[PDB]
Amino acid sequence: GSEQESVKEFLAKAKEDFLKKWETPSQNTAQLDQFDRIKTLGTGSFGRVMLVKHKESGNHYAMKILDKQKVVKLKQIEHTLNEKRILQAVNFPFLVKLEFSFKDNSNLYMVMEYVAGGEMFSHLRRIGRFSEPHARFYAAQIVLTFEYLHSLDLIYRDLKPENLLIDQQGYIQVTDFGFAKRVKGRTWTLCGTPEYLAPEIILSKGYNKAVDWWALGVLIYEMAAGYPPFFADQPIQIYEKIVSGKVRFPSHFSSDLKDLLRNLLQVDLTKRFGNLKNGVNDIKNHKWFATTDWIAIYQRKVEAPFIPKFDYEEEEIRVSINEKCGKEFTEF
């Protein structure tokens, strides 16, 4: 619209703001004995996650402790380094903040902004399906962050309900940047959950940032319907259906939703909304989103569709005497 150029200009500072952090990434912005270990939120594959309280600010963070040796053994030195490099340079309202990042002789630490909400997958199974104006609320946030990400030449390539958490404010928080890559052109690496994989990826051909727009379709659909547009039992058949490109909308889907989904879920990489001349705008302008105030969403002004509800054991913290696999995580 009118002075709707201040977007092409917002996207330009965020860039000069990312590359700067990308060129010379921040390391060791804190240390273990600076936080008060509250509880153990759970143990993952590389290591456990502990709720912590920053002694000084008295703030609450989600420290993801990930064993240096164990990481290497699991064969993921690069995947780890890359996820920390992206998180550290990135900065956007619907992306988890990597508050602090440090290390020692035995393991790497990543202090995240703590969120109590929970995964979209969960909320989806509980609520069943979402109101069109509810999914629209979420899709809006996804659309914005992909615009942010893509401006930076970052392909998320892992959009799915599990990677989406809900704020104590009701908003989205994209998490887990494992498979994210900085790419100008096309790439080939296969990954991510099958029902969101776009035809390009499956047909082992070259793919680009358009993969995220396809997934957004699968996601918008699943939210409003209550189940993914392409679901099977065995992978081989999902692929089949994901390539056929034939979507069947549940009868209650609005005429507007159907249109938007049809453009997003288009096998033709040259007709897909998002990978076109008018780029992101074919999506932000589409009638389905006509009721959404993009700047309000960004500012967190809009009202949330809902807000999730808000004898002490123990654990050890093995911070070894001499540095194990130190040469490997020099960049961390």
Q: What structural class do helix, strand and pairing data support?
A: alpha+beta
Domain count, please report it: 2
Strand content: 5-15%
CATH class of the largest domain: Mainly Alpha
Number of strands: 9
What general form does the structure show? globular
Number of helices: 11
What is the N-to-C order of secondary-structure elements (H for helix, E for strand)? HEEEHHEEHHEEEEHHHHHH
CATH homolog superfamily of the largest domain = Transferase(Phosphotransferase) domain 1
Family: Belongs to the protein kinase superfamily. AGC Ser/Thr protein kinase family. cAMP subfamily.
Keywords: ATP-binding, cAMP, Cell membrane, Cell projection, Cilium, Cytoplasm, Cytoplasmic vesicle, Flagellum, Kinase, Lipoprotein, Membrane, Mitochondrion, Myristate, Nucleotide-binding, Nucleus, Phosphoprotein, Serine/threonine-protein kinase, Transferase
Binding site for ATP: 41-49, 64, 113-119, 160-163
Protein name: cAMP-dependent protein kinase catalytic subunit alpha
List the helices and strands and how they pair.
Layout: H1 10-23, E1 35-43, E2 48-54, E3 59-67, H2 68-73, H3 77-89, E4 98-103, E5 107-113, H4 120-127, H5 132-151, E6 154-155, E7 164-166, E8 172-174, E9 181-182, H6 199-202, H7 210-225, H8 235-244, H9 255-264, H10 281-285, H11 294-299
Antiparallel strand pairs: 1-2, 2-3, 3-5, 4-5, 6-9, 7-8
PDB class: transferase
Keywords: apoenzyme, cAMP-dependent protein kinase, open conformation, preformed active site, transferase
Assembly: monomeric
